[PDB]
Amino acid sequence: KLPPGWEKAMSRSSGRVYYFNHITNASQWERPSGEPARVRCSHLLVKHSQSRRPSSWRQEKITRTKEEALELINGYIQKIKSGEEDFESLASQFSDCSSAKARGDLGAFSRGQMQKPFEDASFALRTGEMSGPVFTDSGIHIILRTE
Numbered sequence: 001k002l003p004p005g006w007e008k009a010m011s012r013s014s015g016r017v018y019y020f021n022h023i024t025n026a027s028q029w030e031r032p033s034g035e036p037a038r039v040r041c042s043h044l045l046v047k048h049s050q051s052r053r054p055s056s057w058r059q060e061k062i063t064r065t066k067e068e069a070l071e072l073i074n075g076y077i078q079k080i081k082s083g084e085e086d087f088e089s090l091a092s093q094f095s096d097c098s099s100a101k102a103r104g105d106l107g108a109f110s111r112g113q114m115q116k117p118f119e120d121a122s123f124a125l126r127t128g129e130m131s132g133p134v135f136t137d138s139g140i141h142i143i144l145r146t147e
């Protein structure tokens, strides 16, 4: 019926149907639209105390909990979706990945090079699409597929 990994859901607060993708954790009101050797993605990483390496250019010792990291991620997604902030701007300022210096761009990559949840979300995103919170051993990601 729907592209890879989409399902119908129902808003608890409005009662209006929406669509959820269980690979990217994206959610939207519209019915989803419509695989390549490679995709190009940017990301914004929020690390937490259980991250593989709980350290970053922003903080020598990352101590926030994983729940706290998810709330930060959720807040960034809200401002990106409202257009109050750009993905690139928030990634430059707040991504715990040193790709913050490149507005979060990771360049292009094939299957097998990234952590599997990141890879699966990246390849399930349509070009221009953004993920919801994506969990890996690094932390929690917002992923933007640029190519």
Ligand SMILES: OCc1cccc2c1OCCO2
Pocket (backbone or CB within 6 Å): 097, 098, 099, 100, 101, 102, 105, 106, 107
């Ligand atoms: O293009 C990606 C990139 C750009 C700049 C810095 C980076 C980085 O990847 C992770 C390591 O730090």
